[model samples]
Target: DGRYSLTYIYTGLSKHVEDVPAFQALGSLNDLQFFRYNSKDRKSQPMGLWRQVEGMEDWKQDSQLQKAREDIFMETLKDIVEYYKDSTGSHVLQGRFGCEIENNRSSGAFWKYYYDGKDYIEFNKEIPAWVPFDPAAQITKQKWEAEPVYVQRAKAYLEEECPATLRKYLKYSKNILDRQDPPSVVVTSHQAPGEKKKLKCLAYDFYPGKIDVHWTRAGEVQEPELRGDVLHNGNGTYQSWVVVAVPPQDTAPYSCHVQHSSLAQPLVVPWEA
Candidate 1:
């Protein structure tokens, strides 16, 4: 209906803008973007560049923009490999570049080089040699030389590049203090009769990811046998669970206590007998 044929969704904008403003420009410019780079110098691609329109299940893809990003990423990869030269017979060294900005200021910028997937050396001061004039050493040397340059770039990105992008792309306004949706809690028990049993409390699909879940038995807060990590649902929500074990014969009131940013008071849900 619009004159310019505006698609029903702006998927790229949403994907990039949720975390911070710096991502918006990167997404716009099709910059090198990824969650990880491995020893093979291969970058793992992001899942996709599309999101469903709010209230509608229909999705639209920015295929052209995504391909442009892929092209830029591969070119940059080639340049890096050539500049460093091959240290190993096979490309077994991994590297990563990361930046963090907080409270409208540059907090940290780093470059890390790894021997393998497990162990790594950081780029703060100087480069060390794996072997004398070997490929690893040569690459490490280049990284050291470029450290200052990337540091300046990181600072500039936070100070200059991210400002206007924040203004244009920021969806959630701080002044609007909206309460996030609370998690749905479920409790279950496991074990045979007359035996010690495990009680599990699960919190599912909650917004504003930070949340705490714990168990209480006989009016005392108890530690859980195991607690699961908070995991993303890829739909702007989160999930987590915790479990505690107790003797079945001790007829006590056991419950789960939950705390979240959205709640004015902590939520306490008792276990079913």
Candidate 2:
């Protein structure tokens, strides 16, 4: 009934800083981080409440995958820094690969790499090659593209392996991933006059990433200026807000309308002047 994504991020550092590891790896479900690994620990450790609930069923194999990916990331980082001929101060290389699923079917996939904070290369399924974003990326692009077997393997991962594994993860994580949590709505009045009595309605602490928040007066829906997209609140929940500007002379009651799966019916909370 919704969408899901599984992403793995691999980060490599040229030099160490404080207690930070030179290499780090992370996995997330729809941008919500679930597990992490670093060169210092050399062990994949689960995060969030998933492990507490389900125990460590997927630990061994998952850690193995992380370790293997770590090797590739380290090698890639070394090659790129060497190619630049400057491994002096501090630099970073990052790679991300993931797939998206709608309802229960795979809808899309992505594979990208970056250096520092700039895009370096990305897998272009259309061109069936690694597309470079910078002149320096051309080096790795040519080298990687020369490996036909690896290209074939990458395509297989995007087209089949990634999706299949995503489905498998979803199969066991459904209870937590698909749970519904209602939104907490509140309204705050702003500006007493100045022709702009700004009012805002906040819809936060919600889940499943679906929420409809709007401002209205006398059943007339007010155009929202802020935004509509629900943002992750970082605790496995989503939040969104809408604000409206009303003139001081206007004598009308304003309300916030909310709609979500957690509610049996639409909820309307009026702002008290």
Candidate 3:
């Protein structure tokens, strides 16, 4: 029972944008970002898998492939501009293509393009044709349709090449890609000077990114005024906190409740401080 996918998002801009690359390519497996190639380096760099594990040259080869794809993407962006009939300010073009495999069989695939941050066109490997989302996309559809081999290439890639590479990635990074780490939670009290008293429930050092934290007082669940969103630790884990206000000098028993996939049951920690 294995499910995996390789997603690639490429963006091109008519005019170079600030703080962002003119051309950016991102490669992700499942939900994990594996590599990113931007115009600055013009090379693909591993995102989470920092260590060189068997695919050092393969990654470089991916860098080479992105260059060819980048050439085509940049050229298409120009065609998009012609379709829109506007060359004024900077226009953005983006394409996302991916293939999903379940139990080593290609089960799902998608190819979509966005123009100026809106839907433009899509490719269907089954029908092997372009579906235009906008009137401007009609031009590209006609162009791509003229070459039967183009659709065949996409069909072959979705069914064969994409899944083949996806299996390799899953083999290389099974541990890093699929991991679950429980969160350590703590409850504490806070006294603000000239302000209302509050209790804080903090949960940190968790993996899988999904976590639920809440506060309860006197055995009754509470609506915390502040519930911190799960935040990345930049090390493949997450952290979150919740704050509930209380009356001054009132010691209504309060506890922090945390629910995570890694935990056997809901982990409840009461305010000790």
Candidate 4:
């Protein structure tokens, strides 16, 4: 009757979970904070005690040695948690347990958050759309958005655990709006009128999705003389072309830009206007 009850739930173990060494490094960076995180001593020694509380009918007891065991268990868990937080720039929140982390991503880092014993939030190089929306918090700020592999893994987890209706919508949203990569802008041609028309160009390639091609006259967006919006690579990546058919009467300068959500900024190519 004097016994205290205990309930336990282990959350945040996933195929997406970062490995031990990587996570341990993270803990040091996070200042070694955690709560309700425990690691078992596979080699624990046997020990116990007996005693009674003030008004208890039955005698109760606890060994200082047993308390030490628990202390070590908690210490190890906190160590690992902090390691992950520092190295990966991700933190684990289990009730009163958590680590403080800076706003950035680490090398080779991916993200997964726990809910109901499953990874509910997953994304690579960036956070997923369903989690929340914030302009300054797109892709993991520490890295560029060139990698979609981690996001793909996260999407797979969402597909596995979310309800069918939500899963279907998530699938459609990614397909309809998500782009695989940003477009590339390069000088496709250069020439001078009223003289020997010397021309050379590089290719502008990009992944499939809606795109905008524009020309800049003087640090501002301007219409191109010729625009081709229907070019595609046919291998699933799409392209749009913008050409300045008529340069300024006097040779000044002209620039081409490719715009998309995945890019840090528009791909810009400048030439003699």
| Cα-based lDDT for every prediction | 0.48, 0.81, 0.81, 0.37
lDDT digits (tens) for residues 67-173 of candidate 4: 44344333433444443455344443221111111121111222333432333333432444333122212322212234666445445533332223222322333
In model 2, which regions exceed 4 Å deviation?
Answer: 49-57, 102-105, 116-156, 188-200, 223-234, 243-251, 261-264
Q: What TM-scores do the predictions have?
A: 0.55, 0.74, 0.89, 0.30
lDDT of 1 by residue, 116-178 (tens): 243334444222222223444455455545766765654454444544343322232221112
Encode model 3's per-residue lDDT on 48-120: one tens digit a residue: 5444446533777878888888888888888888766777769999899888888777888888999888899
Who wins the lDDT comparison? 2
**Best by the TM-score measure:** 3
Error of 2 at 244 (Å): 4.8
Candidate 4 minimal-lDDT segment of 10 residues: 25-34
Cα RMSD for candidates in order? 11.3, 4.2, 2.3, 23.3
> Arrange candidates by lDDT, highest first: which order?
2, 3, 1, 4
Score residue 46 of candidate 4 by CA lDDT. 16
| Alpha-carbon lDDT of model 2 | 0.81
Residues 202-234, candidate 2, lDDT per residue (tens digit)? 888878677788989888998986775555524
Residue-level lDDT for 69 in candidate 2: 83
